[PDB]
Structures are given as structure tokens and as C-alpha cells.
Swiss-Prot record, chain B:
Source species: Homo sapiens
Phenotype for G80A: Slightly reduces catalytic activity. Abolishes activity
Effect of H79Y: Abolishes catalytic activity
Encoding gene (name): PARP15
Annotated protein name in UniProt: Protein mono-ADP-ribosyltransferase PARP15
Function: Mono-ADP-ribosyltransferase that mediates mono-ADP-ribosylation of target proteins. Acts as a negative regulator of transcription.
Disulfide bridge map: none
Superkingdom of source: Eukaryota
Location of the PARP catalytic domain: 2-198
Family per similarity comment: Belongs to the ARTD/PARP family.
Whole sequence portion shown: 481 to 678 of 678
Subcellular location: Nucleus
């Protein structure tokens, strides 16, 4: 069930694990951030070990891999948010009802960390600290979004219930993805950083 | 694991199974419905076999059973809706983003009734062009609940100083619950569709 690179949780179901700087896992996540956010300062990176969220996400992944007849449904994306939302996300994941929604009423994830690093998203807290998640997202098969969507559009108007898995701003060169269901996104790392 | 009493679906992921009057499965739902809806008549009752919705719901049930202390977390409730919504609900379940505002709101979520008479109101089970009304019978993970409030977009915390440890659902009245509101996907499994008429 639980991934191998997680560390022991003494039979508990939720833990935030601060990563050791200079080790492979920390370097890998840092690199993905610094590709576009090298002018920022990383204070720490934490691994989110939430067993319930992981289980519900992996079930949805298995289902999407069956539905789409392929296994290229996952992307690693970024989500900046304010400090007041961090405890909720760690415990409960991403909730579209807490959403601003130009491509649909869902949760938004950025291809580039620099987009999530905007102060409108990763709002600096009273100490100047900014917060950004690295997220496993089941983008699956996607189409262009539009304002007012509550679910992705149907793949074909002849079967209105067979839906795209997510929407984007631009199908040829996406920079953001919107997902409309719980447990289509697993918050995997939390980056705390400053400008 | 899919229930062993379901029909074989030939590797398919979804199907609706028409029940036979006289079988206990049909009669128990009929009795539950007629307890408060004796003036209506049932056309048919279909068992909803949706493999993916069942799996995700059963995962949430197992998690709530773990988290809560030997609590009966699941109730069998009713949900009236319009014909236009039946194909989506059958396939994808109950989406709070599509829910209507209830005439007495205890939160912005999906509403489920204890009494079929409540879901039988035309405001919920809107008659279609042929006069058919539609009501789901739903397994709902009500869990541990409290009285809701109109402003809620998620269940409230049990403890104001631990805002992320939430009630599982809310109700109109904890002493005499008649409706429940849920705020998350896969917290309710549409198990039967009742088609009925006046
Ligand atoms: C609720 C508060 C704290 C105000 C908030 C607001 C926006 C985001 C947020 N938004 C994103 C986004 N959003 C848009 O492109 C437009 O809002 C759509 O019209 C695109 C790509 C990535 C992100 C992203 O990482 N976080 C997080 C939190």
C-alpha cells in the first residue's frame, strides 16, 4: 500500500517528514522548484505521508488507468496557497469548494513553480514565508477549459457522461490544469520558501 | 471487492438491474418507501451496480470505520432528483457542485432525507414529461454529525482549536435527524433508483 520511500510512522496514518538537505529526494524536489524559481530561498521541504489520501488517490489512479486504457494519466504539478490553508491540505487534500476560476470551478495546478509562486497564490504570511505543494495530479485526457464549468466537458456530446479527466488553458502547451473531483490530486511535498 | 450478489457484468463497469417484486431485496425498499409515501405507486426499482463508485465509496467507509470508534457510520437515505440528472448520478454519483439550495439550508452540500416523503416532493423528484418521479436510495457515510448551518462548505470542526478534525456530516437536528448533508465526493453510494408515479 504505502510507498517505499516513506519512512516509518509508528503505526500512525499521517506524518509530515522534513527532508534532509543534500540527499537524493530533497535534491530531486528542489531541482523541480529551482528550474523556474531559482531566485527564491528554500527554508525546508517536507514529505506529506497521508495514508488515507494516498489510498483514495491510488484507487482513482487505478480506475483512470483502466478507463483510458493507458497509464500516462499522472503529472507532477505545483499548487501555491496561503498559510491558513496548509493544515487542511495536508490532512484533507484539495477541495474545489474552498476556491479565480476562469477555466472552471475546480482546483488549479501549475506546470511551472514560478506560476504558483505568485503572491496571489502562495500568499506570504506574517513572516514572509510562502508555501507551495508539489502534487501528483491525475490529469488524464484533457481539453480546454472555460469559465463556469463544474465538471470537465464530455468527450462526445453523444455520451454526455463520458468526461474528460481535467481541463487546461491550452491543450498544445498547457501551463495550468484544473481537476474537479476530490482525490484526483495527492499533495506529496510542501515547500516553504521566501522571495 | 464487488458484492457477490451482483449480476455478472461481463467485464463492464456499470449496469442497472431491474428487481422483481416478491424478492426480499425489492420488498424491503418498497416497504421503506411506502412507510411515508403510501399515496404514490412504484413503477420499478433498479439496483445500481457501479464498480468504480462502489470501490471509492467502500474505501471511504473503511477509513471512517477506522477513524471513528466502533460507530455505525452508514445510513440508508433517500435522494429525489430530476430526470436530467439521473444519467450523471448513475455514473458519477452525487456532486455537491451541482446541488440545489435546500429550502432549509444546513450547508452547501448534497442533501439526503431520512423519509422518502421528503424526497418525494416535486421540488426534488421533479416529474418528467411522462409524469415519472425519480428517487435514489443511498448508502451515506453520515459518521459523527452535528447540527449544520447555512454557511458551511465543509463539515465544521469538532473542536474550534483543531480546525482540521471534522465532523463527518451535518444534520437539521441531532436529536431527531430528518436530513443529512455531505460535503465530499464518494461519501454516498447511489444503490437503488426508484421510478414512481402518482
Ligand atoms: C484561495 C486562495 C488562497 C486565494 C488561492 C487562490 C489561488 C490559488 C492558485 N491558483 C492557481 C491558478 N489559478 C488561475 O489560473 C486562476 O485563478 C483561474 O482563473 C493557476 C495555476 C496554479 C495556481 C495555484 O497554484 N494556486 C491558490 C490559493
Amino acid at each position: 500500500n504505502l510507498p517505499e520511500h516513506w519512512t516509518d510512522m509508528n503505526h500512525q496514518l499521517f506524518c509530515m517528514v522534513q527532508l534532509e538537505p543534500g540527499q537524493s529526494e530533497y535534491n530531486t524536489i528542489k531541482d523541480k522548484f529551482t528550474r523556474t524559481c531559482s531566485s527564491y530561498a528554500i527554508e525546508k521541504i517536507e514529505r506529506i505521508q497521508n495514508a488515507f489520501l494516498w489510498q483514495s488517490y491510488q484507487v482513482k489512479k487505478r480506475q483512470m488507468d483502466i478507463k483510458n486504457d493507458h497509464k500516462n494519466n499522472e503529472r507532477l504539478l505545483f499548487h501555491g496557497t496561503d498559510a491558513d490553508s496548509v493544515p487542511y491540505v495536508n490532512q484533507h487534500g484539495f477541495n474545489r469548494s474552498c476556491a479565480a476560476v476562469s477555466y472552471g470551478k475546480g482546483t488549479y495546478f501549475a506546470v511551472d513553480a514560478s506560476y504558483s509562486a505568485k503572491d496571489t497564490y502562495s500568499k506570504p504570511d506574517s513572516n514572509g514565508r510562502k508555501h507551495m505543494y508539489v502534487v501528483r495530479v491525475l490529469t488524464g485526457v484533457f481539453t480546454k477549459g472555460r469559465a463556469g464549468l463544474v465538471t470537465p466537458p464530455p468527450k462526445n456530446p453523444h455520451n454526455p457522461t463520458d468526461l474528460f479527466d481535467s481541463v487546461t488553458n491550452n491543450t498544445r502547451s498547457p501551463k495550468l490544469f484544473v481537476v474537479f473531483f476530490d482525490n484526483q490530486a495527492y499533495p506529496e511535498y510542501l515547500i516553504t520558501f521566501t522571495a
